[PDB]
Symmetry: D2
Subunit: 386 residues, 4 copies
Amino acid sequence: SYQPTPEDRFTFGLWTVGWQGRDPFGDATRPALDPVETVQRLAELGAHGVTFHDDDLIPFGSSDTERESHIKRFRQALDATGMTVPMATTNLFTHPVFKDGGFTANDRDVRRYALRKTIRNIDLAVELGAKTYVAWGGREGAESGAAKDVRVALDRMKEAFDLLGEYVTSQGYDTRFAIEPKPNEPRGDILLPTVGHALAFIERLERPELYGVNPEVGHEQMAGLNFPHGIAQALWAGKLFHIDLNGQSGIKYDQDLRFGAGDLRAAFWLVDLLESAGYEGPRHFDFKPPRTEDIDGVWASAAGCMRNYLILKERAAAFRADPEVQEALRASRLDELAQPTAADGVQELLADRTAFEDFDVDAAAARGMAFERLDQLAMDHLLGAR
Amino acid sequence: SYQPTPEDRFTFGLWTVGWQGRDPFGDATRPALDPVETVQRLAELGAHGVTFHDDDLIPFGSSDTERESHIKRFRQALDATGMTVPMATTNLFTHPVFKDGGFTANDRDVRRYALRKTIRNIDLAVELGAKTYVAWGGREGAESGAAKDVRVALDRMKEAFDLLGEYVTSQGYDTRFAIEPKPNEPRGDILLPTVGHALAFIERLERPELYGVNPEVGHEQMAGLNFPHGIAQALWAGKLFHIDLNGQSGIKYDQDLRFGAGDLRAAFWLVDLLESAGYEGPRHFDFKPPRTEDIDGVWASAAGCMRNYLILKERAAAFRADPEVQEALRASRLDELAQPTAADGVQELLADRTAFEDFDVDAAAARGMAFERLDQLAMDHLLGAR
Amino acid sequence: SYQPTPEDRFTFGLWTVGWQGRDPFGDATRPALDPVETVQRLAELGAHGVTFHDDDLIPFGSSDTERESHIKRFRQALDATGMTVPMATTNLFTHPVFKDGGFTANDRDVRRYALRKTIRNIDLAVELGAKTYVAWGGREGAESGAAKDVRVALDRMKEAFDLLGEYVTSQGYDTRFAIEPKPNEPRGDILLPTVGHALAFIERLERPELYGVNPEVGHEQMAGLNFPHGIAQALWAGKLFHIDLNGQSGIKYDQDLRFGAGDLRAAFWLVDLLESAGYEGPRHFDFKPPRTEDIDGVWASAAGCMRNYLILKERAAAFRADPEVQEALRASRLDELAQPTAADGVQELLADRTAFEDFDVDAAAARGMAFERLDQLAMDHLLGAR
Amino acid sequence: SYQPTPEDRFTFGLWTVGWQGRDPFGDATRPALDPVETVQRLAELGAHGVTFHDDDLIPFGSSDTERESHIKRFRQALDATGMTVPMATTNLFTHPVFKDGGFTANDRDVRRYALRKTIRNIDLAVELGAKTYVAWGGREGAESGAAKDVRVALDRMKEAFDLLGEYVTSQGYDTRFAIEPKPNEPRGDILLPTVGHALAFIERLERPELYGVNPEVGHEQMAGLNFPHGIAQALWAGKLFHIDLNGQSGIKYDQDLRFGAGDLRAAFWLVDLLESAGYEGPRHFDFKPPRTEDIDGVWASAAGCMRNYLILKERAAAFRADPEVQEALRASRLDELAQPTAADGVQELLADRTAFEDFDVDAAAARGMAFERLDQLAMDHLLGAR
Ligand SMILES: O=C[C@H](O)[C@@H](O)[C@H](O)[C@H](O)CO
Ligand SMILES: O=C[C@H](O)[C@@H](O)[C@H](O)[C@H](O)CO
Ligand SMILES: O=C[C@H](O)[C@@H](O)[C@H](O)[C@H](O)CO
Ligand SMILES: O=C[C@H](O)[C@@H](O)[C@H](O)[C@H](O)CO
Ligand SMILES: [Mg+2]
Ligand SMILES: [Mg+2]
Ligand SMILES: [Mg+2]
Ligand SMILES: [Mg+2]
Ligand SMILES: [Mg+2]
Ligand SMILES: [Mg+2]
Ligand SMILES: [Mg+2]
Ligand SMILES: [Mg+2]
């Protein structure tokens, strides 16, 4: 049964189990966690690696001697546990200088400072082993319409990601970027609000191949969108470089519940998709243990993230492996969807009378899709009533 | 003041003022309108053109002799009024044969029939003068997770749009396609749910240049997204081929209120963007006069669509033309957003100590953005209190 | 196994399995079902009874001979199967005359007609043995602000329910009313939009005890509310007279999915609540088999409604029965929540220095609620991982 | 012009212009404001009064000497400006001890502490002349289903309000309570989530007449509800004791934009309602100047709150005063809505053949409501296009 292994590739941010509980209406309920303690406890839980924002590891404002003490300590913990660092990112949202954005701040000097802060952390991420560098532009956007010309801000956003592509190319680094979309919060509306908007943006950059997406369950659900559908389009585009797993219960503030909570059936269809498409990147949890919890509650919430992924993996595997489900898929013509519509081109199609002139539209309209039966088989597998 | 002219390029679908009032809980409240009567009345209201789905003009199932009677009659009305037909589209949603989709139906023969129905109407649209052919895949999607493999459905969707690109290319037609996104309704989740998802999809087609988007105000608002922001990204990508104007009051069923209703400030920021970016396509209204109205109420609702666009155009023009607003934009550093972040490349940026080492982060953090003052000037212009 | 029997009190509307699949963008995909055939197919499935709108049983406009003939063949089917009719309701939304409302229509003659149509069906409901009479005011509301004065509409809505209470009291009928709330659709905004608004309104009627609520899963979820929370307040108020069970996947158009679909964890906490509070009314399913389905998919969807309630009942019962869960509830102090705050009274609380001046606020702040461990035990029980 | 004077009853919380800009992803961008400076800058702006949470005026944990000193300098500022204190409230959400609630915390000692903290501030509110005492239960609720038994929590919530009613009655205080509803944030789901739920709960308290509601624009809009509709029901119930005015752009995190921003047409229909129903309470602004702003942007945002109410008051007044609008209201039969449906009574309605057996349902169905023309006249008046 459900014990995490290194092969499950479960990772967690320093900021997830390290969340102190501070929210818009309340102070911290927990003490700050030491990164070294977090690496050790996560290694004991069966996680494979940890990720970080620069300001999680090195206190904003640290002198270069305090910086290397922090880095050194962290790296001894990693080396002692065998924990990996698959991804890293920059905090371009906490400090008041980023109140109007990092890469798309109206003030040019803030945009330059944002880029220098990011490059300093790309060098660190690369020596720690990170292959993905995430960008969450949480402050890029607006609360009012004339505060941001969005066509000019997209020029500044393209310009910042192109300069970053330039830099990693000239250094010969093997890192790839993954843009993390979110529709709103903390800005009234955030630029590149969904997976689709981030995908389309990448196609306009100088080096498209260096950039993919880091979609998060709760973010797409804050726009009422189907997260497994958005992940299937990112996989179809070859751009799912990383993923953030957690839970969200509707269109409201961003909750970051542990994975499995929130929309449980969407979590099931997501694990089924990730596992049958053979996604091989980290299964990263970007969640917040509720501020009602003490530190024992924090590790119970982190353990529940992994446990729920493994139960859903087991149930999805059993659903697809079941002969009855395989027969129900044929009955709903999922095999026929995999056949080309018109492989002999549009002239064969135009000549075929059975495709239009002689098509019996009413016989075809009367065929049932048998979708409810197939979805109740999926419901029975998820609940273990099969 | 606010009289529609031909230069305003206002157009309406046959199905908008022709909506009979039928909804999921109620029967029709109005009689069916004759297309000829609609062309004449819209021409009297000051509209520039009309659009149509094939089944609006020619009754589904018409023999080829009844088809040409309908077409002939319509074309005499257009010719008598000088009304244009800038866009046309296919109905791939009403008939029960399309219950699981047109282009991405699981049944291969339905997908072939969908493509033949569409090509027949592209030929008609081209001889009537349409330069844009819209595709709204209202039935492409699902209510349950195993009913549609979305990666395979995107293959079938790419395949259908590529066959259509093939066909118009081989015929030498000057039509371009515009995909119309919608997140849900009538399917639980519709494929390519937002402007961003449709933009990203286009980049994967064989002939990307033939395809753009037809975004609709209320559709992006059904996902709680900022519609002026999504339009600015489609304009930045060079893909705003057409637009559908109406109103929506929140995340709920698709209302199609007349333009100006619903989110009035978003309507203001949309007209400001369309007018200052010099969009030159039709201002098309895809709206439904509420079923509470009789035919006099239908033409009053259609007239209100145009009237509201012209009042907002006038207010947005006055906002941007005001010296005080121009001064407030400089104060919020909207001019500095138009300056390149690092035009002398990443090595100049890396060497600049003022960009990091010597950057006074606290002086910069303390600068106010002056955004509330600028937005209250915009509020005063919209309300005519300035 | 999970076989329904009439002992489980499962009931279905004639309009549910009977929906023909017509939606805002599509025509019917199924033929009309004969009520007699519905009564015996539902009896075969293990249902306990059926409910109806007047217009589901007797076609609008039937002559009295035709009316009596429909009632006759229906009642014969009831007698033959042992099926009961627990509830009935009026259709005050389909006919065009109800386009601005039934009870709160601006036209006074339509409000009188709405009342006569309802009274006629109350007499029939009582003859068939219905104990609850539902009123869903789906047309009471507005799309625009000046169209409905809402304080005056609530006077007309109170007036209508007061006259229906006077009528059944004069007749000595044992029937009570249950108001069914819905936030929107088919009107832009519907009056009494949630459970709370309907509960508050009832306290203003002349005979408050004759009226309760008939909440529906998907309706409260269309406003992003927690449906188990809404039901606990209705049960706390002693007003849960009936309940409509189905599924909804978020804030969008009203889907009416089969129960168990949509928010599955909310369905689990709902069955946990109804079963532990000892609700004794009908478990009524107001759902629509998707229009993708044929008649065999209709009965599979209906059967799935009952199966899912019975699986969730079993898991909720096993959860509450588990000693480890019972121990986790004590650790989270749910036993202390049941203790009175200040049964000693106000002056004793004011004299209690340990309640304020000597309360150690930091020792209390430091106690973790242990809610994540508890919620993961609930997750394990729902998935059958114990 | 639109200059506020104290005659307009505009009031502001100390926590509003006083917000320092700390949010879930960011630190403060503004220094703390001294209450004394807020009182005189707001008096200069034309405000009538200020409101407070205990912890806004007296820092949590102040010794009684420090407490009295804070109250002293505040009261001196009040006396010097002629500013009033119409309302006050308790902070039962910021301190970590309130992480699972104040009045419905699972820990009994915290619920007693919550009551003592509130009573202490009721005595201070009454001394400063407050007539309304608001209770916003922002921590009463849950993120998971078994963490809070909601029927027992509502017994504890009733118990707490009953004891506060007993306390002010024994003291002979002339102060009434107003419950402030909010659907979520900071808890996953908050108890009494909307106006209707709070209204329904009040009818179960021991002294219902001591309690009403303090609805907030953005809170009801976080559940997609019509705020003018919610306010008309509270006014119909005689329970609108206070109101919080601000803006919200849809269903997402609570934004607290300045009034007039967000849904501008809902702000117009809200001022129309408050002004035509003769609401006489404070027009209170509970908003947050965006963290992008400096202290000058704080006072511009505050001034904009008042300016927008005064512009919308003028347009709503001109709308209702227009003979053409008065004629349009008669055409839409808003005068007939005010007529009793059946003042002749139930048996006369039953004997009226014109109400049913001789009602021409198709002539009534054919009458248009003329609501679009009416709504466009309201649009013209709001935009000043007449
Ligand atoms: O909602 C907030 C974001 O998801 C944030 O937590 C990012 O994940 C982090 O900045 C790394 O990308
Ligand atoms: O919401 C429905 C769609 O917007 C529909 O009305 C399309 O506009 C039409 O099929 C032409 O594209
Ligand atoms: O969403 C609509 C309602 O659920 C409606 O169908 C009612 O259930 C019916 O009028 C009788 O109860
Ligand atoms: O969104 C939160 C509430 O608006 C809160 O700030 C209340 O207004 C305050 O506790 C006193 O009324
Ligand atoms: Mg998040
Ligand atoms: Mg994330
Ligand atoms: Mg629409
Ligand atoms: Mg459209
Ligand atoms: Mg429903
Ligand atoms: Mg119902
Ligand atoms: Mg708020
Ligand atoms: Mg408030």
